Amino acid sequence: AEFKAGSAKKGATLFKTRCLQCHTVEKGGPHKVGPNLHGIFGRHSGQAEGYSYTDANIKKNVLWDENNMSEYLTNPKKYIPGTKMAFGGLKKEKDRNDLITYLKKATE
Numbered sequence: 583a584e585f586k587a588g589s590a591k592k593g594a595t596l597f598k599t600r601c602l603q604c605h606t607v608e609k610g611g612p613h614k615v616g617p618n619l620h621g622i623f624g625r626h627s628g629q630a631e632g633y634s635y636t637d638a639n640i641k642k643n644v645l646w647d648e649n650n651m652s653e654y655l656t657n658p659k660k661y662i663p664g665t666k667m668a669f670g671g672l673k674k675e676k677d678r679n680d681l682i683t684y685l686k687k688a689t690e
C-alpha cells in the first residue's frame with residue numbers, strides 16, 4: 583500500500599543502523615559520503631547545497647514526498663539508475679513506513 587505513518591521511535595533506530603553512516607539529518611551537520619537530508623521532503627532531487635551528485639540523481643528531478651521516498655528506498659538503483667548511493671534497499675514495508683515517519687520529522 584501507499585505510505586502510512588508508523589513508528590518514529592522504530593524509524594530512528596533503522597536510520598541509525600542503515601543510513602547514518604552516509605547521511606546527516608541536521609542542518610549544519612557534518613559532511614558525509616551522502617548528502618545532508620535536512621529539508622529533503624518537498625525539495626527536488628539533486629539540490630542539497632555543496633553536495634556533489636551524479637547527473638542521474640539531478641536529472642531524475644523528483645519532488646520528494648513520503649510515497650516516492652518509499653518507492654526509492656525499496657530499491658534506490660531501480661528508481662534512479664546510475665545513482666552512486668550504495669544501498670540495496672529496505673525490503674520490508676513496515677520498516678519503510680517507520681523510517682520515513684522518523685525521517686520526515688527529523689529533517690524538518
Ligand code: HEC
Pocket residue numbers: 597600601602603604605615616617622626627628629630634635636638639655664665666667668669672681685
Ligand atoms: C552510503 C553507503 C549510503 C547509505 C548507507 C545510504 N545512502 Fe543515501 N545517498 C548516498 C549517496 C552517495 C547519495 C547521492 C547519490 C547520487 O547519485 O548522487 C545518496 C542519496 C540519497 C537521497 C537522495 C537525496 C537527494 O537530494 O535527492 C536520499 C533521499 C537518501 N540518500 C536517503 C537515504 C536513506 C534514508 C538511507 C537509509 C535507508 C540511505 N540514504 C542510505 C549514500 C548512502
